[PDB]
Design a protein around this ligand. Sequence first.
Ligand SMILES: COc1ccccc1-c1cc(Cl)nc(N)n1
Length: 213
Amino acid sequence: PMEEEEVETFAFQAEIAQLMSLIINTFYSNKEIFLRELISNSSDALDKIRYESLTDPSKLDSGKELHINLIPNKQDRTLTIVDTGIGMTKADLINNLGTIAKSGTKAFMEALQAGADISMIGQFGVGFYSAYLVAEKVTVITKHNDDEQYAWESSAGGSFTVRTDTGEPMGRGTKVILHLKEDQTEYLEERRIKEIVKKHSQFIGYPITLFVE
Ligand SMILES: COc1ccccc1-c1cc(Cl)nc(N)n1
């Protein structure tokens, strides 16, 4: 029996689209900072959870462990960033991922033309898009205590899809699945991943675990 699934196909806000192009169709060294940004988001997601969790310890029913996991798959050619953070509700997701303007967008783009490093990205509050320095496509699976599991995805081109995730359940948190461009497979090597965590992500306040096949 054929399953059926709803997808909503959104246009990224004009400037988030401009930024995504700029990221994709421009060469930047120091791409590795994409992980730093992704670990940061999770860190922030783990704080929101832990904080709220002292008001409602029942927000931990969905998983008490507060950590980050990195899964590089040499077969899929995916680098998966998993956290047991707070997750996003649909609206958090759509505000976080594309629809709503970001007060740092224009400024960051202006900055990049002036030759700023892609590393500056986080300060402009549009850090997640660095994901696209290395991935052709990016899949975010996410789960918020209040809501259901969502699967967001974009290969860029100006649009993203959001669909309720019928798929591996997570309980709580966000999973960023990076479908690495052909030439960015270095980010599936244990050594490289360990390198960029020690380098840019040392003071994260949660255990981070690297799983290697
Ligand atoms: C796609 O992830 C994000 C993008 C922008 C801002 C925040 C996030 C985010 C939110 C949560 Cl709850 N977890 C994670 N890992 N990222």
